Amino acid sequence: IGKLNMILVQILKQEWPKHISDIVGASSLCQNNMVILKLLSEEVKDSMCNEFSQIFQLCQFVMENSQNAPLVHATLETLLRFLNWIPLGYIFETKLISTLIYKFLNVPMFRNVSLKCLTEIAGVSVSQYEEQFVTLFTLTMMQLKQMLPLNTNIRLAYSNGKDDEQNFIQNLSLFLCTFLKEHDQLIEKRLNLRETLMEALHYMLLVSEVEETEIFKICLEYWNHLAAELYRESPDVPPRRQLYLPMLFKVRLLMVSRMAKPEEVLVVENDQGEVVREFMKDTDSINLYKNMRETLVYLTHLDYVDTERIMTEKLHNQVNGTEWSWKNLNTLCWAIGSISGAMHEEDEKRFLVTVIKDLLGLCEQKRGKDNKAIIASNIMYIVGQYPRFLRAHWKFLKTVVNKLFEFMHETHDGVQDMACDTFIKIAQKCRRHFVQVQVGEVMPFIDEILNNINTIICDLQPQQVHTFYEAVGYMIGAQTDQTVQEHLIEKYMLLPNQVWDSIIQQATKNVDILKDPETVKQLGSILKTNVRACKAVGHPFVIQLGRIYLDMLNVYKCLSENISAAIQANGEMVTKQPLIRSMRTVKRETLKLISGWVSRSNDPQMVAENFVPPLLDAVLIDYQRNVPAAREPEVLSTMAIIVNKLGGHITAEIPQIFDAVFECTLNMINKDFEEYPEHRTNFFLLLQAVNSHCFPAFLAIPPTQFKLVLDSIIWAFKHTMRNVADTGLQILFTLLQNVAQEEAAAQSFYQTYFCDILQHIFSVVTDTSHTAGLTMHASILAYMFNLVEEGKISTSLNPGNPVNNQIFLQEYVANLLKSAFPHLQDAQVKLFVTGLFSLNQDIPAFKEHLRDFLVQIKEFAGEDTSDLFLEEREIALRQADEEKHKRQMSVPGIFNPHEIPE
Numbered sequence: 001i002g003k004l005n006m007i008l009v010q011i012l013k014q015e016w017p018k019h020i021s022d023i024v025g026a027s028s029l030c031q032n033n034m035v036i037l038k039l040l041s042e043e044v045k046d047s048m049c050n051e052f053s054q055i056f057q058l059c060q061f062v063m064e065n066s067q068n069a070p071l072v073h074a075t076l077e078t079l080l081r082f083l084n085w086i087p088l089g090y091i092f093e094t095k096l097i098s099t100l101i102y103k104f105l106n107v108p109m110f111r112n113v114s115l116k117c118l119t120e121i122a123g124v125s126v127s128q129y130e131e132q133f134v135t136l137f138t139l140t141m142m143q144l145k146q147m148l149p150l151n152t153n154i155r156l157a158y159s160n161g162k163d164d165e166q167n168f169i170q171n172l173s174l175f176l177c178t179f180l181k182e183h184d185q186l187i188e189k190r191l192n193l194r195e196t197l198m199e200a201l202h203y204m205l206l207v208s209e210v211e212e213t214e215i216f217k218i219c220l221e222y223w224n225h226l227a228a229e230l231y232r233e234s235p236d237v238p239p240r241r242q243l244y245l246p247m248l249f250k251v252r253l254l255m256v257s258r259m260a261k262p263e264e265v266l267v268v269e270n271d272q273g274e275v276v277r278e279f280m281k282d283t284d285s286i287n288l289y290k291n292m293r294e295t296l297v298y299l300t301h302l303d304y305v306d307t308e309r310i311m312t313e314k315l316h317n318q319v320n321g322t323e324w325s326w327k328n329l330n331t332l333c334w335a336i337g338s339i340s341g342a343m344h345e346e347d348e349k350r351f352l353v354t355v356i357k358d359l360l361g362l363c364e365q366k367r368g369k370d371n372k373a374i375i376a377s378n379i380m381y382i383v384g385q386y387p388r389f390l391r392a393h394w395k396f397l398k399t400v401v402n403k404l405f406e407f408m409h410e411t412h413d414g415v416q417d418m419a420c421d422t423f424i425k426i427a428q429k430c431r432r433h434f435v436q437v438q439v440g441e442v443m444p445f446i447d448e449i450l451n452n453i454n455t456i457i458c459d460l461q462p463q464q465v466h467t468f469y470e471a472v473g474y475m476i477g478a479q480t481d482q483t484v485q486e487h488l489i490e491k492y493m494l495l496p497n498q499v500w501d502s503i504i505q506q507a508t509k510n511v512d513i514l515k516d517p518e519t520v521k522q523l524g525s526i527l528k529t530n531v532r533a534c535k536a537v538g539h540p541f542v543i544q545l546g547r548i549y550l551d552m553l554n555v556y557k558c559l560s561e562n563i564s565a566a567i568q569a570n571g572e573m574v575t576k577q578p579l580i581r582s583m584r585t586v587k588r589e590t591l592k593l594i595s596g597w598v599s600r601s602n603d604p605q606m607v608a609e610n611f612v613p614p615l616l617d618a619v620l621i622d623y624q625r626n627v628p629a630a631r632e633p634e635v636l637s638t639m640a641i642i643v644n645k646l647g648g649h650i651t652a653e654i655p656q657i658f659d660a661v662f663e664c665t666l667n668m669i670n671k672d673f674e675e676y677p678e679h680r681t682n683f684f685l686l687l688q689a690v691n692s693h694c695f696p697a698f699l700a701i702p703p704t705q706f707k708l709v710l711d712s713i714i715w716a717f718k719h720t721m722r723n724v725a726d727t728g729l730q731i732l733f734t735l736l737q738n739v740a741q742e743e744a745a746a747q748s749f750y751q752t753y754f755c756d757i758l759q760h761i762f763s764v765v766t767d768t769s770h771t772a773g774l775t776m777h778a779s780i781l782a783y784m785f786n787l788v789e790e791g792k793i794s795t796s797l798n799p800g801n802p803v804n805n806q807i808f809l810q811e812y813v814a815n816l817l818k819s820a821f822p823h824l825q826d827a828q829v830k831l832f833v834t835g836l837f838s839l840n841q842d843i844p845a846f847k848e849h850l851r852d853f854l855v856q857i858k859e860f861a862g863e864d865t866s867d868l869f870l871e872e873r874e875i876a877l878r879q880a881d882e883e884k885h886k887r888q889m890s891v892p893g894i895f896n897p898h899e900i901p902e
Contacts (some may be wrong), residue, residue, distance in 0.1 A: 004158065005039060007037065008036055008039070008146075008440050009039050009040075009043060012039075012040050012043050013043060013741070014116055016040075016043070017044075017047045017048075020051045021035075021050070022036070023054060023055065023058060024537070025035065025055060026058055028068075028071075028880065030062060030066075030071055030075075030818060031070060031071050031074045033058075033075065033090070034071075034074040034075050034077075034078040035521050037055060037078045037081075037082075037804070038077060038078050038081060041081035041082060044486060047458075048086050049087065049807070050087070050507070052082060052085050052086050052087070053087065053090065055078075055082055055086070055818055056079075056082070056086050056090045056091075058792065058813070059075050059078065060094065060096075061069070062075050063076075063079075063099065063180070064099065064744065069109055069110075069832055072110065073109065073110060073113060076100075076104070076110060076113040076114065076117065076616075077113060078110065079115045079403065080113065080116055080120060083117065083120040083121060083718075084085075084120065084123075084124075085391025090128060090295065091124075091716070092129045092132045092843075093124075093263055096121075097118070097121065097132065097136050098767070100114050100118070100645065101114070101118065101139055101140060101143060102143075103138070103576075104138070105118070105143055105144075106146075108164075111147075111168060112164070112167050112168060112171055114530045114689070115168070115171040115172065115175055116171055116177055116221075116716060118136065119171065119174050119175045119178055119891065120177075120359065120623050121136065122136065122137070122175060122178050122179035122183065123178050123180060123475075124180060124182075125182055125183075125700055130186055130638050134186060134187065134190065134193075135181050135182070136179075137179055137183070137187060137196070137200075137344045137517075138196055138827070140175070141196050141199060141200060141381065142196075144172065145199070148168075148172070149874075150199060150202055150206075150877045152206075153206075153210070154169060154207050154209065154210060154663070155209040155210055157209045157510045158211075158212065158215070159210075159500060159699070161811065163235060166212075166590050169207060169210065170214065170215055170218070170349040171209070172203070173204070173207045173218045173219060173420040174218055175214055176203060176204055176222070176808075177218055177221055177222040179706065180200065180204075180222055180225075181221075181222060181225050181510075183195075184226075186242065188243060197243075198247075203242075204219055204223075205247070205250055205251070205254070205604030207219055208223075208254055208258075209254075212577035213284075213288075217260070217288065219293075220288075220291055220292065220295065221291075221890055223251055223255070223292055223330055224294055224295040224298075224699060225438055226244070226251075227251075227295045227298035227299050227302070227724070228294075228298055229296045230244060230298070230302060231301050231302060232249075233303065233362075239727075241302070244607070246583060247653075248299065248302060248303070249303075249306055251299065251502075252296075252299045252303075252306060252310065252844065253310055255292065255295060255312055256296070256307075256311065256314070256331070256332065256335045257331060257337070258292075258293055259331045259332075259334045259338065260285065260289045260292050260294070260334070260336070261285065261289065261330075261334065262289055262334055262381070263286060263289070264381060264384065264385075264418075264421070265278070265334070265357045265377060265381055265664060266278050266377075266411070266414040266417050266418045266421070266515045267373060267377045267412070267415060267417070267418060269326050269327070269330070269374065269375070274414075275326075275370045275374055276413065277413035277414035277417070277688075278414065278416075279490070284729050287375065288822075288859050289338075291401050292338070293338045293893075293894065294337060294341055294888075294894055295341075296338055297338075297341075297342045297362050297891065297892075297893040297894050298817055299395075300339045300342035300343065300893065301342055301891070301893075304342075304343055304344070305349055305885060307339070307342075307343075307345070308347065308351050311332065311336055311350070311351070311355075312354060312355075312896060313746050314328070314332045314850065315332060315336075315354075315355060315359075318332065318358075319358050319361065319426055321363055326374050327702075329374065329375070329378060330374065330378065331704075331767055333359075333378035333381060333382055334381070335613060336355060336382055337381050337382045337384075337385040337386075338385075339893055339897075340385040340386055340893065340896070340897055341892040341893035341894075341897060342892055342893035343893075345388065347393075347455060348386070348389060349389065349392070352386055352389045352396075353396075355382060356382070356383070356396060356400075359375070359378065359382065360379070360399070360403070362375060362402075363375050363376065364832070369412070371790045372410070373410070373412045373414070373415055376407050376410065376418075376419075377415065379403065379420055380403075380404060380407065380418050380419055380471050381399045381418070382524075383422065383899065384426065385386065385424040385425075385895075385896065387425070387426065387429035387430055387897055388897065390430055390539060391429075391430050391459070392428065394433065394438045394439065394440065397430060398427075398435060398512040400426070401423075401426065401445070404419045404422060404426075405456050408456060408459060408460060408464075408468075409419070409458075409459045411459075412694070416459070416460060416461075416464055419463065419637075420460070420464045420468055420471065422861060423467075423468065423469070423471045424467060424470060424474070425473040425652075427471040427472070427474045427475050427899060428471070428474045428836075428898075429898070429902075431474060431475055431477065431478035432478050433445075433782050434449075434475045434478075435475060435476070435479045440872060446475055446476065446479075446488065447470075447473060449742060450472070450488075450492060452493050452858065453495070454469070456493065456606070459813065462525050462528075463719070465525075465529065466525075466528050466529050466532045467531055467532075468477065469529050469532055469536075470532040470535065470536045471536075472492065472536075473532065473534075473535075474536045476488045476489060476537055477537050477538055477540070482540065484642075485540055486540070486543055487542055489537065489540065489544060490543070491542065492533070493530070493533060493544050496526045496529050496530065497544075497547070497548075499522060499526055500523075500551075501546060502527075503519055504520060504521060504551050504555075505788075506519075506556075507519075507747070508523055509556055511558060513580075514555070514558050514559060515561065515562060517578070517582060517813050520559075520579065520582045520583055520586060521582055521690065523555065523586050524585045524586045524589060525581060527552075527588055527589035527590055527593060529587075529683075530544065530545075530548070530593055531589055531592050531596060532595045532721070534593060534596050534597050534600070535596055535600075538600045539597075539600050539602055541597060542597065542601070545594075545597050546610075549611065549614070550614065552590055552593075553590075553614050553615065553618045553673075555586070555590075556586075556587055556590050557622075558620050559587055560587065560618075560622045563580055563581065563584065563630060564591075564622070564626060564630070566580060567580075567626075567627060567629075567630055572627055572629050572630075575629045575630060582621070584630075584632065584847075587634075588632060588634055590821065590828045591619075591632065591634040591635060591637075591638050592634060594611075594615060594633070595636055595637060595638040595642075598611070598641050599641050599645065600639075603804055604645060604646045604647065604649050607642075607646060607649075607651065608643065608646050608649040608650060610647070610834045612642065612653065613651060615638075615765065616644075616656065619635055619638075620656065620657065620660035620661065621660060623635050623660060623661055623664070624661065624664055628668050628676070631665075631668075631676040633679045633682050634682070635661065635682075636661065636665065636679065636682030636683050636685070636686045637686075639657055639686050640685040640686040640688075640689045641689075643686065643689040643690055643693055643694060644689045644692075644693060647693045647694065648693070648694065650693035650694065651693075651696060651697050651858065654690055654694050654697035654700070654701075655697060655700050655701050656786040658701055658702075658705060659705075660798060662709075663705070663708060665679055665683045666683070666712055670681060670712075670715055670800075673719075673721070680724065684716065684724065684726065684727050684728075684731070687712070687731060687733050688730065689712075691731055691735055695735075695738045697716045698803040699742070699745055710753055713728055713731050713732050713735065714728075714756075714757075714760050715728075716728025716731065716732075717729050717732060717760075717761075717764060717770070717773075718760065718763075718764055718900075722770070722772050722773075725770050725772075726772075726773055726776070727771060729773050729776035729777070729780070730776070732757070732780065733776065733779060733780055736757075736780065736783060736784070739785075740787070740792070746792075747793070747794060747795060750787075750793050750795070750797075751795055751797070754784070754797060755794070755812070756810070757780075757784070757796060757884055758781075758784060758809075758813075758816075761777055761781060762781075762813070762815075762816045762817075762820070763820075764777065765777050765781075765850070765854075766816075766817070766820040766821070767820075768854065768858075768868065769865075771867050771868050771870055771871075772846065772870050772871065772874075774850070774871060775847060775871055776848050776852075778843060778847035778850055781846070781850075782839070782840045782841075782846045783840075784893045785809075785836070786840045786841065788805050788806065789806065789837065789840060791805070793805055793885060796808070797809065806837075810834070810837065813833050813836075814829050814830060814833050817829050817832070817833070821857055824857075832853050835849060835851055836850065851868060851869075854868055855868060
């Protein structure tokens with residue numbers, strides 16, 4: 001009856017660790033006891049682990065003397081669960097390995113469970129018990145060779161085998177992988193065990209051929225581990241490498257054959273037999289590609305010549321049609337592109353010359369349209385990942401760019417997108433080579449591209465047009481000479497400028513044209529193109545922005561008027577219409593363009609003098625008057641960026657910005673979280689920017705608005721979600737630091753808000769709802785305690801009567817703690833508060849003392865304290881990730897050339 005099992009599980013859930021005794025009474029209920037132990041193991045450091053000796057003894061006794069196969073099986077799983085907790089002496093001394101490796105591992109009924117148990121034992125890493133580990137692997141290999149001989153075709157067996165056989169293959173792969181990852185070096189030192197190690201490697205190779213993804217992942221883990229270990233030994237032949245040389249070439253050949261699809265490839269063959277664009281993706285694919293690239297890079301570093309020979313031979317076979325196939329070409333080209341940094345430059349020159357020549361020759365050979373789509377994708381993937389080769393050879397750069405322009409006219413879904421992406425990759429990495437007169441050219445290549453820009457882009461859709469314009473913009477940013485850079489920019493934005501001028505000329509005589517959907521779409525596209533061009537070029541783009549500034553804001557105002565009129569005359573439902581969304585998109589792109597240029601600018605005086613006033617006039621009032629659904633969140637982000645950049649030059653306009661934007665947005669955020677997420681983020685970014693750079697503004701706004709600001713900050717760090725709470729802590733700490741630098745303002749602020757902030761912070765801390773930010777709470781509390789202790793406050797906090805601030809604040813904190821935790825005794829709280837004050841000058845000690853207090857309170861309350869140490873665990877994880885990243889950065893080729901800073 002499962003009801004009894006569920007009742008037992010519930011009883012175990014009732015803090016069993018705090019309070020195996022049942023199985024001590026074990027005597028056909030033995031299988032029931034085993035199932036109960038399995039459930040307990042699922043429910044579950046050193047939780048009286050010595051008591052697990054009872055479980056092991058029962059398991060041994062049942063295993064040795066019981067003939068009931070189901071009972072033995074259930075005991076086998078029960079033992080499998082507890083091998084990680086039973087003391088190592090029992091497993092490594094009580095004849096455990098021998099009994100199941102002999103009696104059960106050969107029996108088909110227990111083969112899977114027995115192998116799984118052996119896998120768990122092999123995973124235990126211990127300095128001693130070396131002889132036991134050696135016996136385990138030497139004995140297991142011989143036993144499994146009898147049933148699964150090395151000559152068996154594991155690929156076919158798994159393909160046609162039943163579930164049991166597939167499970168056995170998976171278990172064998174896991175066992176070999178884990179043991180070798182843990183104890184391979186022990187076997188290598190035994191001279192007589194060379195053949196057994198060779199047989200294990202052979203087994204790993206054969207299993208790798210299995211098509212199923214999980215088995216290949218298991219094998220790839222071990223291959224990556226081995227490749228990493230060999231490479232780190234020595235980036236004569238070293239000892240360990242000399243032992244693995246015969247098998248390395250087979251592993252390399254297998255790895256090249258089965259390479260996974262990179263993310264940069266947007267066109268993939270569909271299993272129906274046709275080539276279609278990529279429309280499905282899985283997080284597992286990225287991890288698989290990362291692991292395969294890492295392993296292949298390590299193997300390439302171990303031997304350049306073999307890798308080059310293998311790839312050249314495969315490519316040559318592809319060219320002559322001996323083994324022509326889409327899958328083979330795809331895998332080979334992905335492998336070639338995935339080692340883009342491993343080889344030295346000198347050898348990379350030859351390899352890439354041959355590869356590019358062969359691929360270009362092959363492109364003109366095949367005739368099918370689908371064939372050119374597959375071939376073209378590989379061509380534009382290889383070249384995209386080898387900017388170093390292109391920068392050195394002008395002819396190949398010219399040829400590849402021309403070929404990309406040719407592919408831009410292909411009438412296929414993914415080829416055009418890949419061509420634009422690869423053009424961005426090439427231009428962004430080879431800037432200076434386009435704006436210079438090369439050896440064999442009469443004028444810079446940028447001039448050729450610009451003069452024929454109309455013909456190149458005729459077949460591209462708007463997104464691809466924007467991508468191409470960004471790519472070309474990256475090329476103009478490298479023209480150092482401003483006198484020529486301005487001419488390049490003027491010729492660069494000629495077509496969008498013509499369309500914009502035509503639209504504005506039409507509007508000037510009949511404003512109704514702005515309501516035509518086609519005109520709105522055209523304006524949106526032009527604004528998107530300008531945004532991308534500004535993102536690429538950078539500061540020198542001001543010439544275009546200054547050209548289209550006033551007209552852009554006039555269009556913004558007209559669109560705002562039209563949308564407001566529509567919403568007013570037909571309600572808030574109209575915001576869902578297509579035309580209204582297009583108009584809002586136009587407004588959004590205007591704001592994004594302004595924000596981008598301002599963030600890239602470096603002349604605050606000119607920006608404040610020329611650009612800010614019209615923007616404020618056009619934007620501020622419209623945001624205030626619009627209904628909550630029609631308010632654009634990008635206004636807050638733009639204002640935050642302008643405040644961050646201009647700093648003191650805009651502090652005089654902060655009162656206007658808050659009067660128009662502040663209170664309206666606050667009422668929109670606090671009522672309910674999910675209503676307006678983006679508005680919240682932008683609003684807090686703007687508030688943080690103002691607090692950091694233009695603090696004196698807070699003294700200019702009326703005191704009621706400052707009260708609202710403080711209420712918003714308080715609501716920020718009392719929120720449930722973490723990130724908004726962290727932002728609130730940061731803003732509050734910065735505000736406390738800033739206010740202390742002004743004499744009268746400091747006294748007024750302390751007298752008005754000092755106690756409330758302490759009360760709120762203590763309420764947050766005691767409730768233990770934001771343990772992630774305990775460090776910030778400690779920092780703020782220490783800061784305020786230092787302020788009071790040093791006498792920086794010249795007026796009594798208590799308004800009833802003058803009194804020393806120290807005594808009053810200590811009593812106040814004691815009262816706060818007593819109310820939060822009524823069971824506390826007076827002396828305990830008094831001592832805690834007395835000790836806390838003395839540590840206000842040492843933030844780590846303050847934090848540790850506060851955490852100790854909370855820990856003891858929780859332990860008395862009987863609540864888990866794990867969450868109270870979240871910061872340390874997060875720091876440990878971050879440090880581990882940083883160390884892993886640092887280690888990889890030292891190995892060329894693991895990171896794409898587009899990921900390494902340059």
